[PDB]
Design a protein around this ligand. Structure first.
Ligand SMILES: CCC1=C(C)/C(=C/C2=NC(=C\c3[nH]c(/C=C4\NC(=O)[C@H](C)[C@H]4CC)c(C)c3CCC(=O)O)/C(CCC(=O)O)=C2C)NC1=O
Ligand SMILES: CCC1=C(C)/C(=C/C2=NC(=C\c3[nH]c(/C=C4\NC(=O)[C@H](C)[C@H]4CC)c(C)c3CCC(=O)O)/C(CCC(=O)O)=C2C)NC1=O
Ligand SMILES: CCC1=C(C)/C(=C/C2=NC(=C\c3[nH]c(/C=C4\NC(=O)[C@H](C)[C@H]4CC)c(C)c3CCC(=O)O)/C(CCC(=O)O)=C2C)NC1=O
Ligand SMILES: CCC1=C(C)/C(=C/C2=NC(=C\c3[nH]c(/C=C4\NC(=O)[C@H](C)[C@H]4CC)c(C)c3CCC(=O)O)/C(CCC(=O)O)=C2C)NC1=O
Ligand SMILES: CCC1=C(C)/C(=C/C2=NC(=C\c3[nH]c(/C=C4\NC(=O)[C@H](C)[C@H]4CC)c(C)c3CCC(=O)O)/C(CCC(=O)O)=C2C)NC1=O
Ligand SMILES: CCC1=C(C)/C(=C/C2=NC(=C\c3[nH]c(/C=C4\NC(=O)[C@H](C)[C@H]4CC)c(C)c3CCC(=O)O)/C(CCC(=O)O)=C2C)NC1=O
Ligand SMILES: CCC1=C(C)/C(=C/C2=NC(=C\c3[nH]c(/C=C4\NC(=O)[C@H](C)[C@H]4CC)c(C)c3CCC(=O)O)/C(CCC(=O)O)=C2C)NC1=O
Ligand SMILES: CCC1=C(C)/C(=C/C2=NC(=C\c3[nH]c(/C=C4\NC(=O)[C@H](C)[C@H]4CC)c(C)c3CCC(=O)O)/C(CCC(=O)O)=C2C)NC1=O
Ligand SMILES: CCC1=C(C)/C(=C/C2=NC(=C\c3[nH]c(/C=C4\NC(=O)[C@H](C)[C@H]4CC)c(C)c3CCC(=O)O)/C(CCC(=O)O)=C2C)NC1=O
Ligand SMILES: CCC1=C(C)/C(=C/C2=NC(=C\c3[nH]c(/C=C4\NC(=O)[C@H](C)[C@H]4CC)c(C)c3CCC(=O)O)/C(CCC(=O)O)=C2C)NC1=O
Ligand SMILES: CCC1=C(C)/C(=C/C2=NC(=C\c3[nH]c(/C=C4\NC(=O)[C@H](C)[C@H]4CC)c(C)c3CCC(=O)O)/C(CCC(=O)O)=C2C)NC1=O
Lengths: 172, 289, 99, 162, 172, 172, 162, 172, 172
C-alpha cells in the first residue's frame, strides 16, 4: 500500500534527510504525466468486461482441456470462479496503475495466490497465459487513439506491461 | 434492505459496507479496525485511553491475533464485564451478547434457554466462546470482518421477528448501549417468552414519539379482538400509541404514554384531541377489520 | 348504576365488560357502548320524547343538569338529523366531558 | 498513510469494485494540489534552517524557565538544545513530507500516533511545540493557496498536540 | 415449529394422558392422506417461479402506482426485494402444507412481517392482495389434473386456502 | 405552539439571561416586516379554495391511478377526504406563516400524519407531490402584485417555501 | 450513494478524525467536475426524448424478433413498447442523475443493485439495454471532457449489465 | 446522507421528471459558491480545538454546578466524555456544512442523542447552551478575514447558524 | 391491591387447600405487631410535609442544576409539580406500609412512572436520590421515640426501608 509520493517519502525518511531536488523534478514530471497515466487507465477501465470475456474466450479456445470434463475450469461454478479470479487480477492491475506503484498489486494478490493455485490444483500456466493475453489486449485497447488528443502514453505502455508481467510471473 | 425509511429508521447511518482486514494490512489500518471493534463490542460506549488494553491490542497489529480473536479478547476482558454483564439481568446480558457478537436479536425463548444454561454450567467465558464460535457467526461474516448488524437484509436466514426486535435493541447511531430508556430491564424477554413483537419506534429528531414504552402492567397485543365489537362501529380499527400527554395535569392523566384502539371513522377527532394534549404519536398501525 | 339505574342480568353486555377487563376498550367507549346499547335505547329512547331523552342523556353522561330548555332544543336536532350514534359521538367529545 | 490516492484505492478495494469517475475526480484534484504544493515544499526546504533556529529562539523566549532550571527534559544544557532543535527540524520535515504527500498521513504516522504518551513519559509540555509551530506558520513566508494549506497542515499538528 | 403428530403429542401431554383412540384414527386417516396432501404440494412446488411472476404480473398490472416513480416497489432494487418477499411467503406456505401445520408459517413470517411492513412504509394492502392472487393461482394450478390418478383432495384445497388466507390476514 | 417572540423568549430563558441587543434589533426588523409577512399571508388566504382545487386538478391529471377504481382516492367519500386533507395542510401552512414559526405546523399535522398515511395505506408520494404543487402555486399566487405597493417580499418567499417543503418532507 | 463528498465524509468518519487537506483536494476536484457536468446534464435533458426514441428504434432494429413473437416480455404489443421506452427513459434519467451527482451512486442504487435478478425473473435479455446504451453513448452529441465522462457512466452501466 | 446535488436528484426522481432549468441555475450558483461555502469551512475546521475549549471554558464558568461535586460533568472521566460529546457535535456540523445539507447532521446525531441525554441524566439545557455558544464563536471566528482574498461569505453565516440552531434544538 | 391477609388468602387459594397452621401463627404475630406497624406509620404520616420539604431542600441544595434555568425543575409550575410528585410517592409509601404489602405501591406508581419520567425528560436519577433521602429521613423520624411507650420499630425499619428502596429502584 504505497503511492509514488509515499514511496519517495518512505525512501527519503529511510535516508533520514529531506527530499533531494532531482526527485522533486521527477515528481513534478510525474504530476505532469499522472493525468496522462490515468486517462488511459480510464480507457482501460471502461472495457474491462470485454477484456476478461475476450481473454477467457481466447484462453478456452486455446486450451480446451480446461473446458473438457475433469478439467479445472470445467464445472459451471468453477468456470464462474475462474472468470472471477481473472476479473480480480485485472482490477488490481488497474489499481496499481492508478496509484502508480506495484506495491498494491503485490499486497493484494501476489504473495498468496501462487500458493492458493498450488493448493487448489489450479494450473498456474493457463492463468499465467490468460493474464498475459489479457495484458496484451489491454495495451492494445489502450494504445489506439479514438477522438482523444494525441498523447504520449508509451512509457505508460512500459509501466502497464510491467504490471501485467509482474502479475503473470507471480502467478506462475 | 431498508432504503426509503432509512432516514427515519436510522439505517442510513449504518448503510456503509463491512470493514475488512487484509492479508498484509498497513499499520494505520489496524487502528481503524480496532476503532470499529471497540465501538461494536462495547455498544458505542467510548473507551478511555487508560482502559485501552493496549497489551492485547498490539498483538492484533502484529498479526498474531485474528480479528475474530480480537473480538473474543475484548469480549472476555474485565472492563467488558463491568460495562455489560455486571449491572444487567442475565437475559439482558444474553440479548446484549447476541447484539454485539452476532448482530441479530435472539429469535425465540428456546434460544435463550441454551445460553442461560451454559452460563450457569461453565461460566461467562465459555458462554462468550459459544456465541462467537457458532456456525451463524462464521457464516454471516468472516473472522477478518468486524461484526455488524444484519437485520434489514433477509440474508436467507432471518425471521421477521429479528428485524422488529433489533430496533428495540438499537436506538440510533448517537445512542450509547449502556444508556437507554429501558435501562436495566431487558426489552426483548417480555416480548420473547410470549413470542410477540411490538411495533418499532424510531429515534427523536426523526420522530418525537420515542417516549412511548410498553409498561410492565399493561401489555397490549396490537390486535383488536373486537374488530370494533367494543368500539361499536363498522369501520376498521387502528392502534394509536401516544408518548407524552402533557397538557392534562396530574389529576387528569395518570400515565403520559398510552395506546388506544380507534376506529378510522373517528380517528381524525382522536388525533386532534390527542394533539391538543401535547401528545406525540409514535406510530399508528392497523389493528383489525 | 350511573347509566341506567339498575342493570338486570339480561341487560348486562358480556361483550362490553369482557373487552373492558383487558384494556382494549376505554371506559368512555364502555359508556358509548352502554349508550348505543339496544336495551338502553328501548328503556329510554323509545319511551321518552325526543327533548326528554336529550335531557335525560345529557344529565347522565355530562353529569350536569341541562342549562335551559333551549339547550335541549338545540341538541335535539342532532339526534334526528344524524342518528343517535352521531348524537352520542357529538355528546361524548365535548369540552366538559373531556375536562 | 492517509494520502488521497491511497485512500481512493482503499475505498475501491473495500467496496470490491473497479475504479470509477469519483477516483478520477480525486486525481485531477490531487494533481491540482501538487502543482503548487511541490514548489512550496521546495521553498520550505530552502528556508528550513533559519525557520528552525527562529522557532527554537521563540520557544526559549516565550518559555524562559526551560533555559534556566536544571533538568534533563529542559534545554538548559547544550545537549537539550541539540536534541530540541533536532525535534524542531523533525516537525518541519514532517510538514514538508505532508506537503509532498498531499495529506496528513506522514505526520500522522511519524509524529502524532505516539506523541501524547511520549510527552507524558518524558515531562515535555506540548505547548512548547505549539509555540514553535505557531512561529513557523507565522514566519514561513509563503503566499496564496500554498500558504493556506501549509497553515492547514501546521494547524492540524497544533490540534493534534492540544 | 410443529407437525401434525407433534401437535397431537403436545396436546396429549398437556392433557397428561395417553393419546385417545379417535385421535389415532384421525392420525391414521392423516397418514393415509398425507401423501395425498403432498403430491399436490409437489405440483405446487414445481411451478413456484411461474406463480410468483404471474402474481407480480397481475399485481403490477392492477396497481400501477407501485411501478410509478415514488412508488414503494418502483426502484429496481426494491422491486427485486418485492419479488423476494413474495417468493419467501410462497415458500413458507409450501413448508406449512408440507408439515401439515400452520405453526411453521406463523413462526417464520407472521408475527414480525406486519410490523416490518409498517416500519418500512410498505403498503400491506398490495402484498395482501398479491398473496391472495398467488394463493388463488396456486390452488388453480394444483387442482387440475395432469397425468395424475384421480383422488379426493377436498381436504387439501380447504387447508391450502386456509394457509393462504392466514398469510394474507397476518400481513394486512 | 410558539411565536417568533415566544421563541426568542424561550431561548433567552434557557440561556437564563435577558435578551441580547442584536436579537432585539432582529425582532424590531421582524416587527417592521411582520405586516410584510402578513400581506403575503392574506393574499395567500383569500385564494385557498382555488389553490386546493387546482392542486388536486393537476395531481389527478398527473396520477390517474388515484382516480382509477381500486385507487386510494377513487371513492367519492375518499376523494372528499383527500380534498379535506389537502385543505387542512394548506390551513396549517397559513397558520405557521401567520405566527412566523414552523412549530405550529409541526405540532398540528407533522408529528402524526406520516404514520397515519402509512396505516391507512395512503401513498405518501402523491400527497407529497400535491403539497409541493400547492406550495408552488401558492408562492406563484402570492408573488404577483394586485393592488399592492411595490415592496420586498423576497424574504417571505424563502420562508413560505421552507414551510411547504417541511410539510412535504414530513409527509413523505 | 457513492458520491465523492459523501464518501469523503465516510472516510473521515470511519477513521474517527476531522477533515484534512485530502477532502479539500477532493472538493476542488469535484467542483472542477461539476462546472462542466451540470451544463452537460442540462444538454442531455434537452435531447432526451429524441435519444429515447432513437435508442428504442435501434433496439428494435438490432433485435427484430422482439417485435414479432407473442410474449409479454417482448415488445410485440403496444404496452410492451410503452413499458419498454419507459425503461429506456429510466436508463437515460439515471445517467443524468449520475451526471449531476458526480458519481455512479444514483445508478448503483436505482438500477444496478437488483437488475440481474429482475432480468432473470422477467426473461429480459440485458443485451437489449446494452444496445440501447451503446446507441445513447454514440448519439448523445456532447463534446470534450463532458462527453468522455458521460461515456464513462454509460460504459459503467454496460459493464454492470454484462 | 444526502448532498445538495443528491437532494435535487431525489426530489426530481420523486417528481419523476427531469431536473427543471431553475433548479439547474440554482445548482450552478451553488457550484459557484460551493468553494465560498468551504474555504470558510476550512477556517472553521482549523480552529476546532480552540473552539471547543473556549466553549467549555465559558460554559463551566457560566454553570459551575457541572464542575461542582455531584454535578454531571464533575468527574474527570465524565468531563473528558463531555468534551468528546462537544467535539463530536462540532465535527458533524462541519460535515453538514461541507456537504451543504443538514441530513448528515440529522442522521449522525440528532434522533438518538436527545434520548441518550435523557437516559444518562445529562442536562440537555447546558449542552444546548454550549452548542449555542460554540456556534456563536464559530461564526465569529469564520467572519473575520486575515490574509485571505475578500469574498461574500454572508450566505454561509445564515446556513451555519441554521445548522448550529438545528443541533441545539435537537439536543434540547 | 392486596393486604397481608389477602396475600395469604390468594396464596392458599392458588394452593387450593386451607391455610396451614404456621401461616396462621405468622398472621397471629402479624396481628400482634400490626399496631406496632400502625404506630410507626402514624408518626411517619404526621410529619409528611416537613419530610417532603426537607427532602427537596437537601436535593436542590445537592443538585443546583435543577434550580438552574433550563433545568427540569426550574420553572415555578414545574417545581410545584415536582413537590407534588414527591408527596405522591411518600403517600403511597404510607399506604403500602399501612396495608403491609408492596402491591399497592406497585399498582399505584411503579409500572408507569418510570416511562412517564423517560417521556417527560425528567431525570430519574435526581428523583431516585430524593426518594432515597426522603426514606432515610422518614426512618430517622420514625425511629426516635418522644412520649411513646417503648416498642420495637426495628422489624418495621426493615419493611419501610424495603418499600422506599423498591420505590427508588422502580423510579431509576
Ligand atoms: C492513445 C494514447 C494516449 C492517451 C491515453 C492520451 C491521453 C491524454 N488525455 C489528455 C487529456 C485529458 N484527458 C482527460 C480525461 C478525463 N478527465 C476527467 O476528469 C474525466 C473523468 C476523464 C474523461 C472521462 C482530461 C480531462 C484531459 C485534459 C486535457 C485535454 O482536454 O486533453 C491528454 C492531453 C495531453 C497530455 O496529457 O500530455 C493526453 C495525452 N494521449 C495519447 O496519446
Ligand atoms: C422469512 C420472512 C421474512 C419476510 C416476510 C421479510 C420481509 C422484508 N421485506 C423487506 C423489504 C421489502 N419488501 C417489499 C415488498 C413489497 N412492497 C411492496 O411495495 C409490495 C406491497 C410488496 C411486494 C409484494 C419491498 C418493495 C421491500 C423493499 C423496501 C426497501 O428496500 O426500502 C425487508 C427489509 C430488508 C430487506 O429486504 O432487504 C424485510 C425484512 N423478511 C424476512 O426475513
Ligand atoms: C456520534 C454522535 C454521538 C453523541 C452525540 C453521543 C453522546 C453520548 N454522550 C455520552 C456521555 C456524556 N456526554 C456528556 C456531555 C455533557 N454532559 C454534561 O454535563 C454537559 C451538559 C454535556 C457537555 C456538553 C457527559 C458528561 C457524559 C458522561 C456520562 C457518563 O459517563 O456517565 C454517552 C454515553 C457513553 C459514553 O460517553 O462514553 C453517549 C452515547 N455519542 C455518540 O456516539
Ligand atoms: C399516582 C402516581 C403518579 C406519579 C408518580 C405521577 C408523575 C408525573 N409527574 C409529572 C411531571 C413532573 N414530575 C416532576 C418531578 C421531578 N422532576 C424533576 O426534575 C425531579 C427529578 C423530580 C422531583 C422529585 C416535574 C418537574 C414534572 C413537571 C414536568 C412538566 O410539567 O413539564 C407528570 C406529567 C403531568 C403533570 O404533572 O402535571 C406525571 C403524570 N403522576 C401520577 O399520577
Ligand atoms: C520525527 C518525529 C519525532 C519527534 C517529535 C520526537 C520527539 C522526542 N523528543 C525526545 C526528547 C526531547 N525533546 C526535547 C525538546 C524540547 N525540550 C525543551 O526544553 C524544548 C522546549 C524542546 C526543544 C524543541 C528535549 C530537550 C529532549 C531530550 C530530553 C530527553 O531525555 O528525553 C524523545 C525521547 C528520545 C530521547 O530521549 O532522546 C522523542 C522520541 N522524536 C521523533 O522521532
Ligand atoms: C415427490 C415425487 C412423488 C410424487 C409426485 C408422488 C405422487 C403420488 N401421488 C400418489 C397418489 C395420489 N395422488 C393424488 C392426487 C390427486 N388426485 C386428484 O384427483 C386431485 C385433483 C389430486 C390432488 C389435488 C391422489 C388422489 C392419489 C391417490 C393415492 C394416494 O392417496 O396417495 C402416489 C401414491 C403411490 C403411487 O402413485 O405409486 C404417488 C406416488 N409420489 C412421489 O414419490
Ligand atoms: C389536523 C391534521 C390532520 C391530518 C393531516 C389528517 C389526515 C387523515 N387523512 C385521513 C384519510 C384520507 N386522507 C386521504 C388523502 C390522500 N390520499 C390519497 O390518495 C392522496 C395521496 C391524498 C390526497 C392529497 C384520503 C383519500 C383518505 C381516506 C382514507 C379512507 O377514508 O379510507 C384520515 C383517516 C380518518 C378520516 O379522514 O376521515 C386522517 C386522520 N387528519 C388530521 O386530523
Ligand atoms: C388586512 C388589510 C390590510 C392590508 C391589505 C394591508 C397591506 C399593507 N401592505 C403594506 C406594505 C407592503 N406590502 C408589500 C407587498 C408586496 N410588494 C411587492 O412588490 C410584492 C409583489 C408584494 C408581496 C408579494 C410591500 C413590499 C410592502 C412594503 C411595506 C411593508 O413592508 O409593509 C402595508 C404597510 C402600511 C401601509 O401601506 O400603509 C399595508 C397597509 N394593511 C392592512 O391593514
Ligand atoms: C429506474 C430503473 C428501473 C428499470 C431499468 C426497471 C426495469 C423493469 N422493466 C420491467 C419490465 C419490462 N421491461 C421491458 C423492456 C423491454 N422489453 C423489450 O422487448 C425491449 C427490448 C425492452 C424495451 C426497453 C418490457 C416490455 C417490460 C414489461 C414486461 C413485463 O411484464 O414484465 C420491470 C417489471 C415491472 C413490470 O412488470 O412492469 C422492471 C422492474 N424498473 C426500474 O424501476
Ligand atoms: C484547502 C486549501 C485551499 C484554500 C485555503 C483555498 C482557498 C481559496 N479561497 C478562494 C477564494 C475566496 N475565498 C474567499 C473567502 C472570504 N472572503 C471574505 O471577504 C470573507 C470574510 C471570506 C469567507 C468568510 C473569497 C471571498 C474568495 C473569492 C474567490 C472565490 O469565490 O473562490 C480561492 C479561489 C482560488 C484562488 O484563490 O487561487 C482559493 C484558492 N483553496 C484551496 O485549495
Ligand atoms: C389511630 C389513633 C391511635 C393511635 C395513634 C394509637 C397509638 C397507640 N400506640 C400504642 C402503643 C405503642 N406504640 C408504640 C410505638 C413505638 N414505640 C417505640 O419505641 C417506637 C419507636 C414506636 C414505633 C416505631 C409502642 C412501643 C407501644 C407499646 C404498646 C403497644 O404495643 O401497643 C397504643 C396502646 C394503647 C394506649 O397507648 O393507650 C396506642 C393507643 N392508638 C390509637 O387509637
Amino acid at each position: 500500500m504505497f503511492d509514488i509520493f509515499t514511496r519517495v517519502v518512505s525512501q527519503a525518511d529511510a535516508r533520514g534527510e529531506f527530499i533531494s531536488s532531482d526527485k522533486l523534478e521527477a515528481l513534478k514530471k510525474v504530476v505532469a504525466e499522472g493525468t496522462k497515466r490515468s486517462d488511459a487507465v480510464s480507457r482501460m477501465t471502461n472495457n474491462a468486461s470485454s477484456i476478461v470475456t475476450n481473454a477467457a474466450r481466447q484462453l478456452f479456445a486455446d486450451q480446451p482441456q480446461l473446458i473438457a470434463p475433469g478439467g479445472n475450469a470445467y464445472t459451471n461454478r468453477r468456470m464462474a470462479a475462474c472468470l472471477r479470479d481473472m476479473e480480480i487480477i485485472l482490477r488490481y492491475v488497474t489499481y496499481a496503475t492508478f496509484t502508480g506503484d506495484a506495491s498494491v498489486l503485490n499486497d493484494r494478490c501476489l504473495n498468496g495466490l501462487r500458493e492458493t493455485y498450488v493448493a487448489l490444483g489450479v494450473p498456474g500456466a493457463s492463468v499465467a497465459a490468460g493474464v498475459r493475453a489479457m495484458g496484451k489486449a489491454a495495451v492494445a485497447i489502450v494504445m489506439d487513439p479514438a477522438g482523444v488528443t494525441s498523447g504520449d502514453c508509451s512509457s505508460l505502455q512500459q509501466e502497464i506491461e510491467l504490471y501485467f508481467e509482474t502479475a503473470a510471473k507471480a502467478v506462475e | 434492505p431498508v432504503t426509503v425509511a432509512a432516514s427515519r429508521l436510522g439505517t442510513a447511518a449504518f448503510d456503509q459496507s463491512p470493514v475488512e482486514l487484509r492479508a498484509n494490512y498497513s499499520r494505520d489500518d489496524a487502528q481503524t479496525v480496532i476503532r470499529a471493534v471497540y465501538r461494536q463490542v462495547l455498544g458505542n460506549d467510548y473507551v478511555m485511553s487508560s482502559e485501552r488494553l493496549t497489551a492485547a491490542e498490539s498483538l492484533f497489529t502484529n498479526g498474531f491475533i485474528s480479528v475474530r480473536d480480537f473480538v473474543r479478547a475484548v469480549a472476555q476482558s474485565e472492563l467488558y464485564k463491568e460495562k455489560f454483564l455486571y449491572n444487567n439481568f442475565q437475559t439482558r446480558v444474553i440479548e446484549l451478547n447476541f447484539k454485539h457478537l452476532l448482530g441479530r436479536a435472539p429469535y425465540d425463548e428456546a434460544e435463550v434457554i441454551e445460553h442461560l444454561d451454559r452460563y450457569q454450567n461453565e461460566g461467562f467465558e465459555a458462554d462468550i466462546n459459544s456465541y462467537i464460535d457458532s456456525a451463524e457467526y462464521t457464516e454471516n461474516f468472516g473472522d477478518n470482518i468486524v461484526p455488524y448488524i444484519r437485520s434489514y437484509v433477509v440474508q436467507t436466514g432471518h425471521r421477521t421477528v429479528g428485524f422488529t426486535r433489533m430496533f428495540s435493541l438499537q436506538r440510533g447511531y448517537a445512542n450509547s448501549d449502556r444508556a437507554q430508556i429501558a435501562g436495566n430491564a431487558s426489552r426483548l424477554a417480555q416480548e420473547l417468552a410470549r413470542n410477540t413483537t411490538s411495533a418499532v419506534v424510531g429515534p427523536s429528531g426523526v420522530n418525537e414519539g420515542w417516549a412511548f414504552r410498553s409498561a410492565a402492567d399493561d401489555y397490549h397485543p396490537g390486535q383488536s379482538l373486537g374488530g370494533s365489537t367494543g368500539l361499536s362501529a363498522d369501520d376498521q380499527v387502528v392502534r394509536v400509541e401516544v408518548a407524552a400527554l402533557s397538557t392534562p395535569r396530574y389529576p387528569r392523566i395518570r400515565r403520559s404514554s398510552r395506546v388506544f384502539f380507534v376506529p378510522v371513522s373517528r380517528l381524525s377527532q382522536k388525533l386532534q384531541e390527542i394533539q391538543r394534549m401535547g401528545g406525540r404519536v409514535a406510530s399508528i398501525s392497523p389493528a383489525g377489520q | 348504576r350511573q347509566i341506567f339505574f339498575h342493570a338486570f342480568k339480561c341487560d348486562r353486555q358480556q361483550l362490553l365488560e369482557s373487552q373492558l377487563r383487558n384494556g382494549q376498550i376505554t371506559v368512555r367507549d364502555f359508556i358509548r357502548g352502554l349508550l348505543l346499547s339496544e336495551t338502553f335505547i328501548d328503556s329510554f329512547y323509545n319511551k321518552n320524547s325526543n327533548y326528554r331523552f336529550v335531557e335525560q342523556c345529557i344529565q347522565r353522561v355530562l353529569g350536569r343538569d341541562p342549562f335551559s330548555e333551549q339547550e335541549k332544543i338545540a341538541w335535539s336536532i342532532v339526534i334526528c338529523t344524524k342518528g343517535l350514534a352521531a348524537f352520542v359521538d357529538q355528546l361524548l367529545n365535548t369540552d366538559e366531558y373531556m375536562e | 498513510m492517509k494520502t488521497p490516492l491511497t485512500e481512493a484505492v482503499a475505498l475501491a478495494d473495500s467496496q470490491g469494485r473497479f475504479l470509477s469517475n469519483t477516483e478520477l475526480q480525486y486525481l485531477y484534484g490531487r494533481l491540482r494540489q501538487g502543482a503548487f504544493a511541490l514548489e512550496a515544499a521546495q521553498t520550505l526546504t530552502a528556508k528550513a534552517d533559519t525557520l528552525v533556529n527562529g522557532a527554537a529562539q521563540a520557544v526559549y523566549s516565550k518559555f524562559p524557565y526551560t533555559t534556566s532550571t536544571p533538568g534533563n527534559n529542559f534545554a538548559a544544557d547544550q545537549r537539550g538544545k541539540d536534541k530540541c532543535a533536532r525535534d524542531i527540524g523533525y516537525y518541519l520535515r514532517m510538514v514538508t513530507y505532508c506537503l509532498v504527500a498531499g495529506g496528513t498521513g506522514p505526520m500522522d504516522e511519524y509524529l502524532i500516533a505516539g506523541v501524547d504518551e511520549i510527552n507524558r513519559t518524558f515531562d515535555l509540555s506540548p505547548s512548547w511545540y505549539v509555540e514553535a509551530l505557531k512561529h513557523i506558520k507565522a514566519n514561513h513566508g509563503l503566499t496564496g493557496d500554498a500558504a493556506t494549506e501549509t497553515n492547514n497542515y501546521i494547524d492540524y499538528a497544533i490540534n493534534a498536540l492540544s
